[PDB]
Write a protein that binds this ligand. Structure first.
Ligand SMILES: *[C@@H]1O[C@H](CO)[C@@H](O[C@@H]2O[C@H](CO)[C@@H](O[C@@H]3O[C@H](CO[C@H]4O[C@H](CO)[C@@H](O)[C@H](O[C@H]5O[C@H](CO)[C@@H](O)[C@H](O)[C@@H]5O[C@H]5O[C@H](CO)[C@@H](O)[C@H](O)[C@@H]5O)[C@@H]4O)[C@@H](O)[C@H](O[C@H]4O[C@H](CO)[C@@H](O)[C@H](O)[C@@H]4O)[C@@H]3O)[C@H](O)[C@H]2NC(C)=O)[C@H](O)[C@H]1NC(C)=O
Ligand SMILES: O=C1N=C(N2CCN(Cc3cccc(B(O)O)c3)CC2)S/C1=C\c1ccc(Cl)c(Cl)c1
Ligand SMILES: *[C@@H]1O[C@H](CO)[C@@H](O[C@@H]2O[C@H](CO)[C@@H](O)[C@H](O)[C@H]2NC(C)=O)[C@H](O)[C@H]1NC(C)=O
Ligand SMILES: *[C@@H]1O[C@H](CO)[C@@H](O[C@@H]2O[C@H](CO)[C@@H](O)[C@H](O)[C@H]2NC(C)=O)[C@H](O)[C@H]1NC(C)=O
Ligand SMILES: [Ca+2]
Ligand SMILES: [K+]
Ligand code: NA
Ligand SMILES: [Zn+2]
Ligand SMILES: [Zn+2]
Length: 789
């Protein structure tokens, strides 16, 4: 209970941690209705607006006013932000030339540059193109500071998952805010964005920046603001806190605005009405910068200008209805709109039949504007599966569309797949620790927490960023990354077995003495060093004319297979006599090998090869491609994809990129946590055998960023694209799979694009250990996602 008759005199926006039964005066008190009865009158002053006028200059200080233009206001830290411009002939910050801030220029008493995060809801990255004509203050931040052309949000591209991701460095599946709306079947409770439950700490996981700071002795200003507090007052409050005594002044601050999200929803991203809210936001930025300048802090503070997600054209006319596909929609609950999550209306309703539902939702309309997924089948890049709050049944919705349960005041919405262009949002960093007039490649918002930690001298809590991947944003305070230690060293087996030692049921139509040393194989096909294996296991390096692999004696297949294809390389067919050829590998024990019998017995499982026979350098070398140690279990459905990739696409990539280096391999993630499975977690084997079945297959495709140089002779920076393809028994995901592979396979692969870093989590491997590049630059390379947009 709150004793409300207390007073907010000399307590306005206190940073005091205060609870029941006492009165509160902080920026969240209204959200709990726990404000002292005089909070409004004392703390939310609105008198005479937010700007000094010439007639107010030198006024006698009236404490009734929202802000002051009195002679004393500067020391008391409560001038209106334009005070000096109007009364002291100063210029607005925006009208001053940009000057590089080489070191922090802070008043005495400041020990480190403060950090202010200026967050804007629904600020689509392409809004920046409007420039200084519309947003002159923001355009100055952007061009003088450090900027990305866009920042990638997390999926779902809505507010609560994205804000909490910014604050923690964690994917939603990890921090627990997997949506604006959620149901937790263990709590048997519903989370609503507005409502009582969301204030319960039990929903929120990980460790947000304000906690990380506090726990390490760095004071934070309160990040959240009760919605009724006007933006002008939020700014004045931040400024006032910045004028506090040395022993009270916070080091980190956050502002937030619900715009331009609100107007975007009403009028759509390209609506003419969007100009006004954007001007209004810019004005708030100008107030902050003018205020910092008055305080002599405009070359002292680091400012981050950042959004949670973008905004797409979405209207009532573009709504799919589940009732068009399903008979009894009143028995399910749907989280609707720009994504779909389905559960039975009655929790744990036994008659709930998700397989039948999915079947009715699969490719039933030629123009179908969503696609059903069991969550473990969603593209791995979304990292959206490992949480009890994420329904098994998901609908990825096509950009510009809505899905609803059954049968216009809006023109815009967001929430779609986070690689969609309209969903991209903004990042600008300005201040002494940031670079001057520097553009950086787009990056994911999960990376920001580490950097904000660096900016504040903090040690980040465990998170999903890759610390160091954003060192190129910063002048100083960079984080020196260290290469992870190899845990398992490889063996280099020679000939140790006789063809007669082998009894695998394999057959092949193969001079005796002419029947594999290192030589130049490493330098030709393994360009960036061997991957390091970061877990305890047993594996062998195997060399070949056309490829190298790190073969696992535990999982009975390569962990990685590496090869280079030159621009001019030739694609050849598999000779008729070799169609079913599998050859034992005398370097490897028959006990550590697969066998062809298990495949003959398994009516549903077939096999493929990691190095493709189609790209062998010679008919002789081609026999290497048929080694049992190059073999992997593949469903016939998957083989349609894999053979098309191997036979047609790799060559196409080599032609287009002036050669390519390829690293392919298996991934096991049966528990859908995005992490390499341990042995006990694998759930499927080839029939009657111990050959484990991968849940996915990866490929990492590298070339020279300077495409004029061949991939194998690259001097400088690298270019990479990767995928993690789901290993599935059907092509139900591809609505056009009945057609030739030229009509559907690349579309599937594009959806399952991935970062090398994603593959590293899933494999326990560490790539690119041996290059001519800095480790930070390599970290940047590993977090790159090729999006095809
Ligand atoms: C992204 O980055 C994050 C952060 O680094 C990674 O997530 C971590 O993954 C590790 C490895 O699996 C987890 O380690 C296990 O830790 C548990 C106990 O952890 C508890 O304490 C820690 C520390 O305070 C908390 O962070 C944990 O919070 C989780 O659970 C609470 C419970 O409500 C929840 O509110 C949070 O949202 C969060 O949930 C998320 O993770 C859990 C799994 O832990 C998952 O169920 C949920 O859906 C969310 O994803 C938690 O309170 C410990 O028991 C385990 O021990 C195991 O190994 C040891 C070996 O010594 C064995 O002895 C033991 O028997 C177990 O086998 C693990 O150590 C860690 O919890 C988790 N951290 C967080 C915050 O999620 C991701 O993996 C990264 N993602 C990718 C793809 O790289
Ligand atoms: O003062 C604040 N008010 C916040 N609100 C209140 C207003 N909300 C508007 C809203 C509500 C429901 C859905 C959306 B949407 O666009 O998906 C937006 C969003 C949550 S967050 C916030 C401060 C904040 C919170 C987290 C971070 Cl990381 C930072 Cl930098 C700042
Ligand atoms: C609720 O708040 C008011 C103000 O703090 C408290 O009123 C005071 O109570 C003390 C003790 O009874 C008196 O000596 C003062 O004269 C009161 N001050 C004023 C200005 O009213 C009241 O006690 C609180 N109620 C509680 C504690 O439940
Ligand atoms: C899947 O779609 C079919 C229609 O294609 C639904 O089948 C109908 O179901 C009702 C009641 O079960 C029958 O009276 C109709 O005759 C059926 N139509 C046809 C053409 O078979 C089926 O109900 C749907 N399944 C789900 C889970 O919604
Ligand atoms: Ca796993
Ligand atoms: K078979
Ligand atoms: Na299909
Ligand atoms: Zn938002
Ligand atoms: Zn919104």
């Amino acid at each position: 209970w709150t004793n409300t008759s207390g007073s907010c005199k000399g307590r306005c926006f206190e940073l005091q941690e205060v609870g029941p039964p006492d009165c509160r005066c902080d920026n969240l008190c209204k959200s709990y209705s726990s404000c002292c009865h005089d909070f409004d009158e004392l703390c939310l002053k609105t008198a005479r607006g937010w700007e000094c006028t010439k007639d107010r200059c030198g006024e006698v200080r009236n404490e009734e006013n929202a802000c002051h233009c009195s002679e004393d206001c500067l020391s008391r830290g409560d001038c209106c932000t334009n005070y000096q411009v109007v009364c002291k002939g100063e210029s607005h910050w925006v009208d001053d030339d940009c000057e590089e801030i080489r070191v922090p220029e802070c008043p005495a008493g400041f020990v480190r540059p403060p950090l202010i995060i200026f967050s804007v809801d629904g600020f689509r990255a392409s809004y920046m193109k409007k420039g200084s004509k519309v947003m002159p203050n923001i355009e100055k931040l952007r061009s003088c500071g450090t900027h990305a052309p866009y920042m990638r949000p997390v999926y779902p591209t809505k507010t609560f998952p994205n804000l909490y991701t910014l604050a923690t460095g964690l994917y939603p599946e990890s921090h627990g805010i997997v949506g604006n709306s959620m149901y937790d079947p263990v709590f048997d409770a519903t989370f609503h964005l507005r409502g009582r439950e969301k204030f319960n700490h039990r929903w929120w996981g990980g460790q947000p920046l304000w906690i990380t700071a506090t726990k390490q002795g760095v004071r934070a200003g309160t990040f959240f603001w009760s919605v009724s507090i006007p933006h002008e007052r939020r700014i004045l409050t931040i400024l006032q806190w910045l004028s506090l005594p040395d022993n009270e002044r916070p080091s980190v601050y956050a502002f937030y605005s619900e715009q331009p999200d609100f107007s975007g929803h009403k009028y759509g991203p390209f609506g003419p009405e969007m100009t006004n809210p954007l001007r209004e936001i810019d004005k708030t930025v100008g107030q902050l910068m003018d205020g910092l300048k008055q305080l002599k802090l405009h070359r002292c503070v680091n400012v981050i200008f950042v959004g949670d997600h973008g905004m797409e054209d979405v209207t009532c006319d573009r709504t799919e209805f589940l009732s068009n596909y399903l008979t009894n929609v009143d028995d399910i609950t749907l989280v609707p709109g720009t994504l779909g999550r389905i559960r039975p209306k009655i929790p744990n309703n036994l008659k709930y039949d998700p397989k039948a539902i999915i079947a009715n939702l699969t490719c039933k309309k030629p123009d179908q504007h969503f696609k059903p997924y069991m969550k473990q089948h969603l593209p791995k890049r979304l990292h959206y599966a490992n949480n009890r709050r994420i329904e098994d049944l998901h609908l990825l919705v096509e950009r510009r569309w809505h899905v609803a349960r059954k049968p216009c005041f809006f023109q815009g919405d967001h929430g779609f797949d986070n690689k969609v262009n309209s969903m991209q949002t903004v990042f600008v960093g300005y201040g002494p620790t940031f670079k001057y007039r520097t553009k950086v490649p787009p990056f994911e918002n999960i990376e920001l927490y580490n950097v904000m930690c660096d900016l504040l001298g903090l040690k980040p809590a465990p998170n999903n960023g890759t610390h160091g991947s954003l060192n190129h944003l910063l002048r100083t305070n960079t984080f020196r990354p260290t290469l992870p230690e190899e845990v398992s060293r490889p063996n280099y087996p020679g000939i140790m077995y006789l063809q007669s030692d082998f009894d695998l049921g394999c057959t092949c139509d193969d001079l005796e003495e002419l029947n594999h040393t290192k030589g130049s194989t490493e330098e030709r096909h393994l360009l960036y060093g061997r991957p390091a294996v970061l877990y305890r296991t047993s594996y062998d390096i195997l060399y070949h004319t056309d490829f190298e692999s790190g073969y696992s004696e535990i999982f009975l297949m390569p962990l990685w297979t590496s090869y280079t294809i030159s621009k001019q390389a030739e694609v050849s067919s598999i000779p008729e006599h070799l169609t079913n050829c599998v050859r034992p590998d005398v370097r490897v024990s028959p006990g550590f090998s697969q066998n062809c019998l298990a495949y003959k017995n398994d009516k549903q499982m077939s096999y493929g090869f990691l190095f493709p026979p189609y790209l062998s350098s010679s008919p002789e070398a081609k026999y290497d491609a048929f080694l049992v140690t190059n073999m992997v279990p593949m469903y016939p459905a998957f083989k349609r994809v894999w053979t098309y990739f191997q036979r047609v696409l790799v060559k196409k990539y080599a032609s287009e990129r002036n050669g390519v280096n390829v690293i392919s391999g298996p991934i096991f993630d049966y528990n859908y946590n995005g992490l390499r499975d341990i042995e006990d977690e694998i759930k499927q084997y080839v029939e009657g055998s111990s050959i484990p079945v991968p849940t996915h297959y990866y490929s990492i495709i590298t070339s020279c960023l300077d495409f004029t140089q061949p991939a194998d002779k690259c001097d400088g920076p690298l270019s990479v694209s990767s995928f993690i393809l789901p290993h599935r028994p059907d092509n139900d995901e591809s609505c056009n799979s009945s057609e030739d592979e030229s009509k559907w396979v690349e579309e599937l692969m594009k959806m399952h694009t991935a970062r090398v870093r994603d593959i590293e989590h899933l494999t326990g491997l560490d790539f690119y250990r041996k290059t001519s590049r800095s480790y930070s630059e390599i970290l940047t390379l590993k977090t790159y996602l090729h999006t095809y947009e």
